[PDB]
Amino acid sequence: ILPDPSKPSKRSFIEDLLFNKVTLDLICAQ
Amino acid sequence: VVNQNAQALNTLVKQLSSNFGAISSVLNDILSRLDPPEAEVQIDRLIT
Amino acid sequence: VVNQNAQALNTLVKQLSSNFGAISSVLNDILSRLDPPEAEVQIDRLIT
Amino acid sequence: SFTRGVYYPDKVFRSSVLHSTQDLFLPFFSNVTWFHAIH
Amino acid sequence: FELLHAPATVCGPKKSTNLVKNKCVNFNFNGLTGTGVLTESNKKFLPFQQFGRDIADTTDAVRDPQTLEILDITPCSFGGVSVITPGTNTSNQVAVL
Amino acid sequence: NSASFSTFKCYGVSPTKLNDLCFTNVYADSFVIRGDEVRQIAPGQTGK
Amino acid sequence: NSASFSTFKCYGVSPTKLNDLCFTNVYADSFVIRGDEVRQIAPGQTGK
């Protein structure tokens, strides 16, 4: 759960897992 | 919560397709059919 | 909290200055210019 | 009539967009009169 | 007559002006006005798929009535005007976003 | 601009925008009337 | 059904529904006006 220096950002091993589950052309029409 | 805001935003866009009793649902071709002396009657329905 | 309390009250009175598409924003000026038979539909629009 | 009788109601092309449209169509799974006009 | 659904046969007597490509210009195809940028388009129209629409019933594609070409209608950039200031008591120079 | 005609009223299109609009399925109909039935070609009337 | 009447215009109700309504009272008035004075009979008109 701590940030890892592997990826360029300071994102953690659980944050990217959380970042991928929920998601937001459909956006171009608006 | 993220979907609900998106679902409300998308539903807002759909309402542009309804004329609200006017002759057309698009403002572009209404002005090309009615003179401004009488265009106020039809556009006012869409405004409300 | 004091500010937008005052802004909301100021806006409501300021909304009275607009004719909303009618002939005038003064009810007395409607009777002095146009007869009631075709004035009851703009006064109705003012109320709405 | 398991699956047959779908056509474009209008001439306007659309690509996975949302727009309600009501038009006459052939209902699915409906009984039809199959005619055999030979002897 | 019928409006905005069938292909337009009877049409007005105005000159056939040359097309301007890939920049914000007005357009008028079979009496359909609008503002945007016309680009060469994918999503091959069927032989009788003339017009085009979207969720908001706003035009997104159109074909040239004189040449068999399929285009897209895309409105170019826009937005609001915002100002960044440090206050009248501070200075006069500002930033606009 | 022709002064020979005596009735040039259009109920769906402004006369000044006739040349600026391109239509489809333009159909032509012709008949005769007694002379007092000119007001009955509105969209919804009474009479014969 | 009779076509002997040359002036039949009313906005309160529709003639086609006169056979499907009950009135509970009927008032009939008789008076004589000029040919161009028929415009003065509709409720809420301008003049004398």
Q: How many other β-carbons are positioned within 10 Å of the β-carbon of residue E3?
A: 18
- Is residue C30 within 8 Å of residue C37, measured between CB atoms? no
DSSP labels for G5-41?
A: -S----SSS-GGGTTS---S----------GGGGGGS
Terminal-residue alpha carbon distance, chain F: 33
Cβ density class C16-35: b for 16+ within 10 Å, e for less: eeeeeebeeeeeeebeeeee
For residues E8 and B9, give the distance between their C-alpha atoms in angstroms, rounded to a whole number: 35
Partner residues linked to E83 by β-bridges: E96
Six token digits for residue A7: 């990826």
CA nearest A28: which of G40, E10, E75? E75
DSSP labels for D1-39?
A: --S-----SSS-B-SS---------PPTT----------
B29 touches chain E (CB under 8 A): yes
Cβ density class B31-46: b for 16+ within 10 Å, e for less: eebbeeeeeeebeeeb
For residues E26 and E24, give the distance between their C-alpha atoms in angstroms, rounded to a whole number: 7
Closest chain E residue to A28 measured between Cα atoms?
A: E74
Six token digits for residue C8: 């909301």
Taking the CA of residue A18 and the nearest CA in chain B, the distance in Å comes to 14
Rounded to 5 degrees, what are φ and ψ at G13?
Answer: -135, 175
Strands, sheet with E61-63, edge to edge from the N-terminal-most edge strand:
E25-29, E32-40, E70-74, E61-63
Sign of CA dihedral C27, C28, C34, C38: positive
The residue count of chain C comes to: 48
Rounded to 5 degrees, what are φ and ψ at B5?
Answer: -65, -40
Amino acid at G30: S
- Strands (DSSP E) along C1-48, which ranges? none
Subunits with 3+ C-beta pairs closer than 8 A to E: A, B, D, F
Contact state of B2 with A24 under an 8 Å Cβ cutoff? yes
Taking the CA of residue F28 and the nearest CA in chain E, the distance in Å comes to 9
Q: How many other β-carbons are positioned within 10 Å of the β-carbon of residue B26?
A: 21
For residues G32 and G45, give the distance between their C-alpha atoms in angstroms, rounded to a whole number: 18
Q: Is B8 left (phi over 0), alpha (psi -120 to 50) or beta?
A: alpha
- Is residue E29 within 8 Å of residue E64, measured between CB atoms? yes
CA E1 to chain centre: 26
Name the 3-class secondary structure at F24. Answer: strand
Q: Which residues contact B23 (CB under 8 A, 6 or more apart)?
A: B30, B33, B42, F12
Chain E environment of B14 (Cβ under 8 Å): 55-56
Residues 50-89 of E with CB under 8 A from A: 54-56
- Is residue C30 within 8 Å of residue C43, measured between CB atoms? yes
Amino acid at A20: N
Q: Do D and F make contact, counting contact as 3+ CB pairs within 8 angstroms? A: no
Cβ density class G14-36: b for 16+ within 10 Å, e for less: eeeeeeeeeeeeeeeeeeeeeee
Q: Is G47 left (phi over 0), alpha (psi -120 to 50) or beta?
A: left
For residues F4 and A12, give the distance between their C-alpha atoms in angstroms, rounded to a whole number: 85
B8 touches chain A (CB under 8 A): no
Q: H/E/C letters for each residue in chain E?
A: CECCCCCCCCCCCCCCCCCCCCCCEEEEECCEEEEEEEEECCCCCCCCCCCECCCCCCCCEEECCCCCCEEEEECCCCCCCCEECCCCCCCCCCEEC
